[PDB]
From a paper:
The spike (S) protein on the surface of SARS-CoV-2 exploits angiotensin-converting enzyme 2 (ACE2) as cellular receptor and mediates the fusion of the viral and the host cell membrane during infection. The activation of the S protein requires the receptor-binding domain (RBD) binding to the peptidase domain (PD) of ACE2 and the cleavage by host proteases into the N-terminal S1 subunit and the C-terminal S2 subunit. S1 consists of the N-terminal domain (NTD), the RBD, subdomain 1 and 2 (SD1 and SD2). Here we report the cryo-electron microscopy (cryo-EM) structures of trimeric extracellular domain of the S protein (hereinafter referred to as S) at multiple states and conformations, including the all RBD-locked, activated, S1/S2 trypsin-cleaved, PD of ACE2-bound, and the full-length ACE2-bound states.
Since PD of ACE2 exists as a monomer, whereas the full-length ACE2 presents as a dimer, a critical question is that how the full-length ACE2 binds to the S protein. In order to investigate the interactions of the S protein with ACE2 in a condition more closely resembling the physiological condition, we tried to solve the structure of the S protein in complex with the full-length ACE2. We prepared and purified the S–full-length ACE2–B0AT1 ternary complex, which showed comigrating bands in size exclusion chromatography (SEC) analysis. 2D classification exhibited blurred density on the top of each PD of ACE2 dimer, which was attributed to the S protein, suggesting that one ACE2 dimer can be bound by two S proteins simultaneously. After 3D classification and refinement, we obtained two conformations for the S–ACE2–B0AT1 ternary complex with resolutions of 8.3 Å and 4.4 Å, respectively. The right PD of the ACE2 dimer in both conformations is clearly bound by one S protein, whereas the left PD of the ACE2 dimer is bound by a much more blurred S protein and by a much smaller density in conformation 1 and 2, respectively. The local resolutions for ACE2, the left S protein and the right S protein in conformation 1 were improved to 8.4 Å, 10.4 Å and 6.7 Å, respectively, which allowed a docking model for the S–ACE2–B0AT1 ternary complex. This finding confirmed our previous hypothesis that one dimeric ACE2 might bind to two trimeric S proteins simultaneously. Furthermore, the structure of the S–ACE2–B0AT1 ternary complex indicates that one ACE2 dimer binds two trimeric S proteins simultaneously. The two PD domains in a dimeric full-length ACE2 cannot bind to the same trimeric S protein because of the steric constriction, unless the RBD undergoes dramatic rotation as suggested by a previous study.
Residue numbers in the entry:
A (entry chain B): 58 to 737
B (entry chain D): 602 to 737
C (entry chain D): 126 to 193
The structure:
Amino acid sequence: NVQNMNNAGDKWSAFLKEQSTLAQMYPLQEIQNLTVKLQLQALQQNGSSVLSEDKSKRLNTILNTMSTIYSTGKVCNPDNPQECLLLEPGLNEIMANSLDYNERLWAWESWRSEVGKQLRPLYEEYVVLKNEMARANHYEDYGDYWRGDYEVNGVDGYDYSRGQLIEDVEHTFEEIKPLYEHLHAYVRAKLMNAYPSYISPIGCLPAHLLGDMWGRFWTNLYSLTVPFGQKPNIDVTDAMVDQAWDAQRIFKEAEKFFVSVGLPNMTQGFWENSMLTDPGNVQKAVCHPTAWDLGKGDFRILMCTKVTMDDFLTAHHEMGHIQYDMAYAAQPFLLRNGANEGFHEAVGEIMSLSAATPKHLKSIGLLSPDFQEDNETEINFLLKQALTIVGTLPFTYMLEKWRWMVFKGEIPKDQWMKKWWEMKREIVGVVEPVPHDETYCDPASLFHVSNDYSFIRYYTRTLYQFQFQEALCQAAKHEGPLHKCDISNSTEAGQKLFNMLRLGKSEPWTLALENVVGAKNMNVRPLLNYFEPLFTWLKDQNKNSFVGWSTDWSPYADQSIKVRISLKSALGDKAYEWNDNEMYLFRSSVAYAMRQYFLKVKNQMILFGEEDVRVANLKPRISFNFFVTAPKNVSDIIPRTEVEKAIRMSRSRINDAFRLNDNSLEFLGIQPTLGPPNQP
Amino acid sequence: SFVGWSTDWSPYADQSIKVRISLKSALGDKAYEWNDNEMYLFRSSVAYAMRQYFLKVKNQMILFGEEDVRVANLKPRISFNFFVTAPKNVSDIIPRTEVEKAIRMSRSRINDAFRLNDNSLEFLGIQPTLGPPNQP
Amino acid sequence: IYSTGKVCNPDNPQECLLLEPGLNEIMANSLDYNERLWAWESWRSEVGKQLRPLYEEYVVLKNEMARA
Ligand SMILES: *[C@@H]1O[C@H](CO)[C@@H](O[C@@H]2O[C@H](CO)[C@@H](O)[C@H](O)[C@H]2NC(C)=O)[C@H](O)[C@H]1NC(C)=O
Ligand SMILES: *[C@@H]1O[C@H](CO)[C@@H](O[C@@H]2O[C@H](CO)[C@@H](O)[C@H](O)[C@H]2NC(C)=O)[C@H](O)[C@H]1NC(C)=O
Ligand SMILES: *[C@@H]1O[C@H](CO)[C@@H](O[C@@H]2O[C@H](CO)[C@@H](O)[C@H](O)[C@H]2NC(C)=O)[C@H](O)[C@H]1NC(C)=O
Ligand SMILES: *[C@@H]1O[C@H](CO)[C@@H](O[C@@H]2O[C@H](CO)[C@@H](O)[C@H](O)[C@H]2NC(C)=O)[C@H](O)[C@H]1NC(C)=O
Ligand SMILES: *[C@@H]1O[C@H](CO)[C@@H](O[C@@H]2O[C@H](CO)[C@@H](O)[C@H](O)[C@H]2NC(C)=O)[C@H](O)[C@H]1NC(C)=O
Ligand SMILES: *[C@@H]1O[C@H](CO)[C@@H](O[C@@H]2O[C@H](CO)[C@@H](O)[C@H](O)[C@H]2NC(C)=O)[C@H](O)[C@H]1NC(C)=O
Ligand SMILES: *[C@@H]1O[C@H](CO)[C@@H](O)[C@H](O)[C@H]1NC(C)=O
Ligand SMILES: [Zn+2]
């Protein structure tokens, strides 16, 4: 079957480049109808193939090499080199379940460093080749090529520029920063009880204590940050196995939700062709929830559903992709997508929000008609939402802002990892535990960076999701808070939803938003109205706390020693210049001095290397900080009092290696002491 | 043919350089003792000198380490042979003529790290050359 | 350690060869000087180091059992 789909897959791809090279026979500005212009521009798009034919095969070699490094990485446990852990099984489980500080610090660092280095040279060669392909298609860089999805040209008042997306993201983000600061302060106060003597009460959060490998979602911090742990968060999984609900009941109650709002039934080919469970055969078949739109009005759902409220909800999510697909099936073929890249997931998740409410669960038969929702359980529910929704918004905004500045050249390649960690402390409020120089590439250790994907679609989908939900609940005549809303039994709300679903790509997306919301731009005020019961409760829990963070604190910067070097004072017109070969000799001289101290004082032999001296904050005056680490235990920092005694023992030897004289090589905090004079 | 073998030949011992160190001649009653921490500092000073030669002459950046300097035949008089290898290619030995040019470029820096004076740190086969005198 | 040793090819760290399949085939079939020199050294060094401390502790305990 794989050979059955590779030849049938290439007949589709070879056919499309043949019609693409036929499309440049027609000019594009001699067209008047907006629909036939939109189909022509989506087919005329050259994309690749604008490069030289030896540069085009170099780019595909880089994209295949970066993709197989990410999926085949082995991490070695420094106590047993015969057991290598590989990213998805084993390294993702440590970052999501462990409470050991030293084991989370190990998994972060190792993985990072290794994959980092590899993806470095490759990613560097990837930026040059992608900017050449974008400038041959008349964009300024590859970041402007990614923002071409949101572009709208000449439809009388609904236009949108590719540079206008940058201001609308930064204008909407500075209204989330009051809400994110109070969530950052509450999580920091709860993490100090889980990790004492590791977290500052006025500083950033360490990057390896956030719940996963990159801090993208904070959703694994719920067991440490739960407001009222003596109240069970509502879970209807036992009431499903007490009424003998089969595999088919979960979709038939899902189809009754959509026919309740005024949307069509399933297509009745949906029930035979689909595969709602893994089969009765032990059948090798990728088990991953998804919605297929094969064509010719044939819609199938592929998932392996278990009787759980989790897959009761993603059944409502995956059916939402189908009802979006069944609506625009009357457009031409090249306009059968969502209106932008963000609308398709956003319509799927407002079906899941409306089905997870306890108002909907007690009317669908799954909750005791004598159930009492208290105000303590609504805080437990809203905080679990904010760890996934609000916690991912400064991560998404910071990452696309870094990638946009790399493509246009505002960040040169000698400052990639310098500007990356300055933007973590300032925007996200997250500090690294170990300093990282320009041999690492920490963005490329994420999936979407090393596999060539755009990331701004996760920011805009979060904002469209609550704009849709607030506009539908005013049509369904809701009375309470926004997070209690349900659009069942309405017809007027579904008519408000169906007027957008059938457009496809035939209209500009700004014209699609006014059919539901009533505005021409994305707005953050419906997102904040969802979380005002949490924002009121959060401001009362932070009366004795400090809201905000300092970008100066680090988890290593209290065992560091500052070094200051004055070369032109000692030698003057005859002094060498301080390149990074002199930094290599300095790190070997400190590692030599630590070896001599532990042998002659502590009677131990420890093999310190130059890779165990970690240098941060290199300035032009020639100043940096350093701290010393045990040879393969990255979590073991030698204390500052033992490094001062080691440097005092061998200060005369370090001075002679650089021709300095204790006034041109200063260790700040260590002073020369002895020397009584006399002789007469 | 020749029947039998010699126990003196080695496949690396024609790109090796012999080093001789006379500690008690340079300092005398006040000289440190040569443990294996001093051999670690010597292997880092040679790796530093190979880094500076390839950057300023060959315009390349190569990350030589102390594990790329291979020391053999350590004696009590303080003498050994060493040869330099490319950073992870164990089969690539840097030639003897390129290591002599790298040591000549940074001999004054290696001497200062050990307080020796070109008669107490001898690289056998490399000689000091310059120094014309005058002033009147 | 002897039965589960991985050797990494310095041009692709994502492919580790383990003694009986792959490292014994290089030493028995190759005519490349630089590839035989790599397989010898690598394997040697790694397993070498490990078996060192262990083998050192093994001599002391086996001499105690023999002298009793
Ligand atoms: C060009 O634009 C016109 C309107 O601007 C489209 O005309 C409509 O076409 C459909 C079927 O093709 C008719 O049912 C409508 O009644 C037409 N509208 C009007 C106002 O006459 C036309 O379809 C566009 N061209 C293409 C190829 O789609
Ligand atoms: C697709 O690539 C072609 C080049 O192969 C681009 O085209 C040319 O258009 C100019 C006019 O601007 C002509 O003078 C050239 O003759 C065309 N190419 C040649 C030499 O055949 C074209 O602009 C690209 N299309 C897109 C999507 O921008
Ligand atoms: C849930 O509602 C109850 C009922 O109002 C709240 O209890 C009140 O809390 C305030 C502030 O601490 C007190 O001044 C009142 O006297 C309490 N009412 C009673 C009847 O004792 C409770 O604080 C609410 N919980 C949350 C999380 O909002
Ligand atoms: C929302 O829709 C459901 C589904 O039709 C309605 O549920 C019915 O409720 C009545 C009385 O409450 C029962 O006698 C029926 O058996 C229910 N039908 C099903 C299929 O379970 C519900 O009443 C509707 N809500 C409103 C306010 O009309
Ligand atoms: C690496 O160093 C850390 C200390 O920084 C070690 O953690 C200690 O582990 C022991 C037992 O495992 C505990 O009794 C100590 O309380 C731990 N120290 C701290 C500060 O938490 C860790 O064991 C070291 N790892 C290795 C492999 O030696
Ligand atoms: C390691 O160094 C050796 C040389 O000592 C390299 O072998 C050369 O390989 C090229 C092509 O592979 C041949 O043209 C040369 O004739 C080889 N040299 C010798 C002396 O045989 C080897 O390629 C290097 N390995 C790496 C990974 O760089
Ligand atoms: C959808 O199907 C049900 C039975 O499966 C049927 O009763 C209902 O009328 C259908 N909806 C419409 C709009 O016909
Ligand atoms: Zn989805």
